[PDB]
Amino acid sequence: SLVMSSPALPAFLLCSTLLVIKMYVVAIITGQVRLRKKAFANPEDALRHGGPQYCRSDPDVERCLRAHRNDMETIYPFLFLGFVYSFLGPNPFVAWMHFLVFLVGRVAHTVAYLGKLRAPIRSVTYTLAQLPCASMALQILWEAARHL
Amino acid sequence: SLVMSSPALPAFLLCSTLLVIKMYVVAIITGQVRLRKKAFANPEDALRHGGPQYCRSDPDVERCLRAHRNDMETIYPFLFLGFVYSFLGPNPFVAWMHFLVFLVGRVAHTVAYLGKLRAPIRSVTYTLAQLPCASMALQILWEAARHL
Amino acid sequence: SLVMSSPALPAFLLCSTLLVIKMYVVAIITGQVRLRKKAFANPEDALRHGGPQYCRSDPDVERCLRAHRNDMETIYPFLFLGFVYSFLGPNPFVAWMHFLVFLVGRVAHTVAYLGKLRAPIRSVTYTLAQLPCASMALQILWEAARHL
Ligand SMILES: CC(C)C(=O)NCc1ccc(C(F)F)c(C(=O)Nc2nc(-c3ccc(Cl)cc3)c[nH]2)c1
Ligand SMILES: CC(C)C(=O)NCc1ccc(C(F)F)c(C(=O)Nc2nc(-c3ccc(Cl)cc3)c[nH]2)c1
Ligand SMILES: CC(C)C(=O)NCc1ccc(C(F)F)c(C(=O)Nc2nc(-c3ccc(Cl)cc3)c[nH]2)c1
Ligand SMILES: CCCCCCCCO[C@@H]1O[C@H](CO)[C@@H](O)[C@H](O)[C@H]1O
């Protein structure tokens, strides 16, 4: 199997795929909030589900959208950085720690966001998860630059 | 050519690249709607195109932005999942069906969204396209986990 | 090192990683604008930083969010397209020019957006950066199609 291409790759693929699934969960939650609170973004949706007055914004829907957007701002770069980083021959344990800190930090971020936890819990989880990303980005820069 | 690395890869690259181009088309449409309806997001844009009153929201522009955002929420994960999945030695026909269902579902989604088709047509296309993504995600999880 | 897999790859990884870092910079700027202008998206954030009246929108924050969103609409597809393109054996110089035009165009875009430069400077930088992306997308299409 081509998952064996590098020692850190299986760990990366596990964490990344779990995070993609976590984003899918956020999308499902968003839909449920829209349906249960009757807050739709489109008139065609609202008309099917009770009338035009239900094409409206809702604070909980907006919160779900913010969590999903923050995921797109952070998890998508990780998908790129972590994949490339897996092929740079990092220490296996060190690589696992990068991926695990990101995974735990991002899951905690979504819990803090959707659960409306007190500040600065969410902000802290964002920063903690960004640390391994910054680390990987720098390592990739050095490897790329030295092969120019 | 390195497109021959795995039997499913060419099909994946065809569908993915078509979907990226489809997102570029949505961006172009959005710009055209802004210009034709004179609804700009920035005062500097509005001042060049008729005056400050044209820095304003428009329902059609907002709809275009929602379609593009939904694309980012779904197509970007597919770019990751489908690429990895291509290297897990899936049955070629089964892989093609995953990619084709996603491609058709997503093109239909954009048509349903921008064309303002009645509910739940758009919602159905979203769910149909998510099915192969969920399938690939699970398969990657198993492959990654078993190589830990 | 696996950065040597193709002659264009190191250049791609350098430009892509710089652009990811540039997006991280936009996120940091956004946070600074929120804190300094006291414009938070969440009541929990506002309550920690002065009171509920600071859960409010701000034009500079919204501008930062637009720049970041435009980055997600353009840089993320480049991460995919440029990676695949690196493995299609393009002329090394031609590949470098694709990556450099994208890098310069996107950095200029962020400067034009956040710096509130007169129209159509930002629009021009967007279009200039999209050119190499369109070029790579077409080249990938041909390579993928011919291997079907
Ligand atoms: C995460 C998504 C799925 C979500 O929750 N979104 C909330 C939402 C918003 C608006 C609408 C409606 F206005 F269009 C609907 C709706 O009525 N959807 C709907 N889908 C089916 C469906 C899908 C697949 C299949 Cl095989 C069969 C039936 C029926 N109804 C749902
Ligand atoms: C998908 C994009 C392209 C789109 O439609 N956006 C709508 C839009 C919004 C705001 C503005 C304006 F306010 F800044 C403009 C505008 O006047 N753009 C503009 N670009 C050129 C251009 C570009 C490349 C080249 Cl080589 C030559 C000339 C001229 N004008 C356009
Ligand atoms: C780009 C990000 C970082 C940014 O600027 N966002 C603006 C912002 C918005 C809201 C809040 C607050 F309401 F939650 C805060 C805030 O007080 N954050 C905060 N982080 C720490 C922190 C982080 C890591 C560590 Cl190891 C230690 C302490 C403290 N305070 C910041
Ligand atoms: C991967 C998806 C994680 C979902 C985390 C959702 C956490 C929900 O947490 C809930 O939040 C509510 C406020 O929103 C509170 O009223 C509840 O006390 C709390 O249980």
Ligand SMILES: CCCCCCCCO[C@@H]1O[C@H](CO)[C@@H](O)[C@H](O)[C@H]1O
């Ligand atoms: C608040 C400041 C944040 C700093 C970001 C932490 C990133 C550290 O990243 C580290 O950088 C070193 C030098 O490039 C590398 O040698 C290490 O491999 C890398 O882990």
Ligand SMILES: CCCCCCCCO[C@@H]1O[C@H](CO)[C@@H](O)[C@H](O)[C@H]1O
């Ligand atoms: C990849 C991009 C696909 C573009 C699909 C746009 C479909 C446009 O479809 C149009 O929508 C209008 C409402 O918006 C209707 O008034 C028109 O009858 C319909 O033709």
Ligand SMILES: CCCCCCCCO[C@@H]1O[C@H](CO)[C@@H](O)[C@H](O)[C@H]1O
């Ligand atoms: C409404 C419920 C949605 C279920 C998502 C469909 C995903 C099915 O995906 C399937 O999962 C199996 C078990 O992991 C795998 O063996 C198959 O290879 C895979 O195609």
Ligand SMILES: CCCCCCCCO[C@@H]1O[C@H](CO)[C@@H](O)[C@H](O)[C@H]1O
């Ligand atoms: C990668 C991040 C690039 C940051 C570019 C920010 C450019 C800031 O530029 C500033 O913009 C202000 C208006 O916003 C003007 O008042 C100032 O004259 C100008 O210096």
Ligand SMILES: CCCCCCCCO[C@@H]1O[C@H](CO)[C@@H](O)[C@H](O)[C@H]1O
């Ligand atoms: C305004 C029109 C924009 C056109 C997009 C420019 C993309 C050009 O891209 C070019 O396309 C050729 C034909 O497919 C290829 O042979 C070249 O390798 C490629 O660089």
Ligand SMILES: N[C@@H](CCC(=O)N[C@@H](CS)C(=O)NCC(=O)O)C(=O)O
């Ligand atoms: N787009 C972000 C940029 C900065 C950021 O990512 N901040 C973190 C830590 S405070 C966050 O959780 N932001 C909330 C959000 O993006 O909605 C924002 O507007 O806040």
Ligand SMILES: N[C@@H](CCC(=O)N[C@@H](CS)C(=O)NCC(=O)O)C(=O)O
């Ligand atoms: N961000 C989405 C999450 C759920 C989702 O993706 N729903 C599908 C099917 S109803 C959709 O097309 N959403 C419309 C949109 O994202 O604007 C939303 O707000 O609706």
Ligand SMILES: N[C@@H](CCC(=O)N[C@@H](CS)C(=O)NCC(=O)O)C(=O)O
């Ligand atoms: N989502 C974009 C689609 C078109 C686009 O990307 N336009 C470029 C050139 S005018 C841009 O810089 N848009 C500003 C933005 O996305 O906020 C929009 O609403 O404008």
